Write a protein that binds this ligand. Structure first.
Ligand SMILES: *[C@@H]1O[C@H](CO)[C@@H](O)[C@H](O)[C@H]1NC(C)=O
Lengths: 103, 438, 49
């Protein structure tokens, strides 16, 4: 006598023993994914199922965040430099009227 | 009327569909795959089994000469020696220093028990399917059986319903196989007339009792021993017993999709995979004019409760107003979830409770009663028990497990700074022109 | 046979040959036979009339 651990997929698994007709046993998911209107660690459930396709979304989210931040920062900085440079102003001065708005 | 629809390969899983016709109530059609029967095309190659050798009484010439003739017996061999003094209980039968000669021969035949211990080598090909269906339309049941080939309609009530071809062909059978005592083993046996001593199929025969037989198992005769007449021989063990000790496990315990395989048809059964299209013709008599069917009014959908599960763990409630009595079917126009019952008694203002199941915890869909329909949205939870073999995944997942909350977080997440970038560029252009004013 | 595995037996001299350089088969997968004649035809399936 002993014990054995057999992994079962979502599809289904067969099971034999002794000399009697076998029994088929399948499985489903029970990890705690869905939230209840409050902040929650839903990701863990989505990590328990399909460890693929679950972190790829996070990587894409990070990529989008970085792309947006970098592009916005570069464009705002360049536009500000263009608006300020030929104007050739100084901080706390009379000419920087538009500056009173800009910064 | 005529209709078409595709169903996955699986046994004992009723699917409920609707046929819509203006002026006629949409009949509820129930389709069940009672059983499956995959039957390939077979060819018999040769039989084999444990063999018994033959050591016939020797041909001894007292003070003479002999030779090594030929014969048609399988593994037939002869060999001769001279200057032999055989002996026996009454004494020495003959002695002649050189003139004596002895001739021995050897062959083989299938053992008497072979008749039941025999195995056979089979050449298989061109897997073909036979499917049994139970189809119910308007409490009109029909049991039918037909091939999946798109040409032949099975006959049941003389209603020709075509189906197939199979979406994807699956065959656990290799082109070559062996059969023994009700078991089927996947093996690459050698060709007829091709043998190797100590190897499987060392002995062949077109029939279990065919007179013709051929083999080759390295039978070389041995010189006579000291003073006692006998026939010392040599030969390699039967490949039958060797292959038995190491034949490998039966295909019964290795086929995918839970095939149930039997020998006398050399077929598989209740083995499910893929999808099948189906064409269905229906008499118009079975159809019912809409006016005859009851009408409904201001029906509402109410989810009493629902836990995401495998069985019909989802529960729903419906409140309806009607001007007529009778029956109506119900349907889930959204694939993600499927009901468990077809129709029920109706009432002028009654309400009912319904069972169903789903492939996602998001119970957002539309459901039709009589000809009208109403929406139903809710959230279902995963269950505690997570190991059961009863029917499950009646619908395949469609990446719809994504909760509405996750969609809400994703929508507000993705940025739109590119609009800010374009606004910055436009103001940059205007400021550049203003600077150009100087 | 032309199969590269089996040697035909003649004097117990095993001479192997093949495989065929190019396979040729006038027979279609489906055929009909009648009175000693063979006609190449695509007959319908059993139970299909
Ligand atoms: C099937 O239902 C119709 C009404 O929908 C009814 O008239 C008929 O008697 C029923 N047939 C059976 C066999 O129950």
């Amino acid at each position: 006598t002993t014990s054995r651990n057999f992994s079962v997929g979502r599809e289904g698994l067969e099971y034999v023993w002794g000399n009697h007709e076998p029994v088929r046993v399948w499985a489903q998911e029970s990890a705690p994914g869905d939230p209840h209107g409050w902040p929650h660690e839903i990701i863990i459930h989505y990590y328990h199922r399909h460890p693929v396709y679950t972190v790829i979304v996070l990587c894409g989210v990070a990529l989008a965040i970085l792309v947006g931040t970098a592009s916005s920062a570069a464009c705002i900085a360049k536009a500000r430099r263009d608006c300020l440079t030929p104007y050739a102003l100084a901080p706390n001065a009379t000419v920087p009227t538009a500056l009173a708005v800009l910064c | 009327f005529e209709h078409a629809t595709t169903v996955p390969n699986v046994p004992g899983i009723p699917y409920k569909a609707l046929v819509e016709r203006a002026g006629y109530a949409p009949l509820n059609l129930e389709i069940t795959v009672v059983s499956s029967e995959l039957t390939p095309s077979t060819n018999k190659e040769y039989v084999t089994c444990k063999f018994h050798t033959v050591v016939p009484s020797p041909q001894v010439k007292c003070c003479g000469s002999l030779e090594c003739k030929a014969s048609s017996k399988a593994d037939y061999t002869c060999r001769v020696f001279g200057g032999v003094y055989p002996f026996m209980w009454g004494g020495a039968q003959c002695f002649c220093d050189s003139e004596n000669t002895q001739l021995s021969e050897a062959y083989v035949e299938f053992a008497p028990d072979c008749t039941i211990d025999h195995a056979v080598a089979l050449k298989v090909h061109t897997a073909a399917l036979k499917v049994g269906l139970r189809i119910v339309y308007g409490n009109t049941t029909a049991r039918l059986d037909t091939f999946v080939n798109g040409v032949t309609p099975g006959s049941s009530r003389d209603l020709k319903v075509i189906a197939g071809p199979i979406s994807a062909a699956f065959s656990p059978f290799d082109h070559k196989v062996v059969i023994r005592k009700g078991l089927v083993y996947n093996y690459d046996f050698p060709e007829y007339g091709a043998m190797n001593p100590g190897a499987f199929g060392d002995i062949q025969a077109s029939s279990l009792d065919a007179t013709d037989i051929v083999a080759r198992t390295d039978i070389r005769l041995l010189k006579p021993s000291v003073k006692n007449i006998h026939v010392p021989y040599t030969q390699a063990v039967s490949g039958y017993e060797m292959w038995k000790n190491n034949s490998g496990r039966p295909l019964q315990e290795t086929a995918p999709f839970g095939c149930k395989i039997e020998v006398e048809p050399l077929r598989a059964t209740n083995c499910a995979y893929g999808h099948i299209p189906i064409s269905i013709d229906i008499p118009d008599a079975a159809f019912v004019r809409s006016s005859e069917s009851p009408t409904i009014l201001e029906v509402s959908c109410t989810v009493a409760d629902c836990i995401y599960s495998a069985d019909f763990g989802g529960s729903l409630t419906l409140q309806y107003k009607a001007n007529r009595e009778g029956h109506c079917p119900v349907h889930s126009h959204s694939t993600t979830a499927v009901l468990k019952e077809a129709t029920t008694h109706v009432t002028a203002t009654g309400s009912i409770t319904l069972h169903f199941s789903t492939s996602s915890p998001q119970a957002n869909f539309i459901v039709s009663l009589c000809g009208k329909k109403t929406t139903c949205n809710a959230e279902c939870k995963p269950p505690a028990d997570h190991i059961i073999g009863e029917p499950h995944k009646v619908d395949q997942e469609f990446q719809a497990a994504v909760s509405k909350t996750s969609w809400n977080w994703l929508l507000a997440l993705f940025g739109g700074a590119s609009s800010l970038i374009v606004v910055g560029l436009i103001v940059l252009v205007c400021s550049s022109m203003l600077i150009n004013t100087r």
